[PDB]
Amino acid sequence: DLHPYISCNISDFKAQKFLINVSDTGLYIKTKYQDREMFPFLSQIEMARAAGAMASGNPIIKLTELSFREPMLQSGSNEQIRIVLTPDNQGASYSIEKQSDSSIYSSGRLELEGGAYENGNIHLEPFLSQRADRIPHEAFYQRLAEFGYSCSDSLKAAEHCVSRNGQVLLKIKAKAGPKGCIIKPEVIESVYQAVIYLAGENAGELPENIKECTIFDHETEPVYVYAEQDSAYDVYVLDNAGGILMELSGLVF
Amino acid sequence: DLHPYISCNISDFKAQKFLINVSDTGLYIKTKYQDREMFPFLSQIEMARAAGAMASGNPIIKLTELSFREPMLQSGSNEQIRIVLTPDNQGASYSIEKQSDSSIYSSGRLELEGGAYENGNIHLEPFLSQRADRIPHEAFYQRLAEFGYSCSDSLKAAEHCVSRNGQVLLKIKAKAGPKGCIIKPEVIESVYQAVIYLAGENAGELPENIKECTIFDHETEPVYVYAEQDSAYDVYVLDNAGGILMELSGLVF
């Protein structure tokens, strides 16, 4: 395997591409819109980041103009999943597809000219003072369930939740897992969970568009997830002191 | 493994390419020009044919303008070997290289517009009548040794030899081996051995150029190797009745 979600390189003259296999990961979500279980939406960013790094020879720091079109239904048929990457002058594009018919699950762009970004800081103090306001782990997910979202325990990283004024700070505990994942499945799913909590009924349980995704620091331990905001959302993964490790800007359902 | 000599696909945006690994094949030759053992020259055609088929999505029938520049010395350093394939309007080109410095072992072209070729026939009768003229297996290779060529028993497929007028017909027995090899190592090495026998001292123990290589039939069992001919050579692999299964034209030392 090239990566926990990428089994091998199947590139050819026609296009650069890799074979995706998430059968044996324990990661699924369910929504009120679907009878069948699904592979979490946003973990596809890790698929693109891993594929792009291998195809480009350098790390992938920034992904832009992400588009999610279909959920990864997990059934018995087992539709083989592949990612196609196309270089161009701006950078590169990527398509995560069914191999049988090339139909798109999600698409996006990759920044290939690596540039050092200085990360920001979320001042965490206002959320920390309301210790009584904290929603416990069990209640937090019961509410997402009442909004129509549930997930495997392997994706339940939220320990407690503070929500005020259309803003939410989640306390998360990452799960040590395969070395290969830069973006851990439970961490990036906490990002999606935070949005569903703010959006509530306004959640489409499919993020149609995401303008930017920047990965400032994948070695520091993620501790918090902060989300805010015109149904457009910005999300941040933070270290123990608020330091921004990853940013998702302009998520729109 | 993608093939007995190809372990995986390592293509990227810069070029289509595969990783070669022949460490654990039992196949080596020695020449008077080299202290070290070598991987047989002509088995690289199988590397190109296998890589080209995978890169193009269709069989490889014809290889043209083959150029051999360096022997594959087998040492302890273990230089990782790769094949680069470059598509173009005529067809495609291929380079078999050291991965560390991209230095070429051999190069050639691939025909990608597959066309049905009708194979020819070598009339075998004249060589069959001289049963007394047959050189036995042991004597045949003792003579190649006296010309400065020896090889592992895994490449000793010649059973006996008939030579007249600068022409040679070898009786060969293929060795059942890994399914993946279309061109078996001992079969194509018999081709080279036949040439060394005709060329003798005129052998350079490195085939600098080969104009054409056509593979008409890789399922029928190869039985004979016929070679002839201005130190340019033409060689043929034949079925039990002379039917041409593979042609190497214009081999030049």
UniProtKB/TrEMBL annotation, chains A, B:
Residues 1-253 form the PKS/mFAS DH domain. Residues 1-117 are annotated as: N-terminal hotdog fold. It is found in: Cytoplasm. Residues 132-253 are annotated as: C-terminal hotdog fold. Involved in some intermediate steps for the synthesis of the antibiotic polyketide bacillaene which is involved in secondary metabolism. This is SDR family NAD(P)-dependent oxidoreductase. The chain holds residues 1259 to 1515 of 2902 of the full protein.
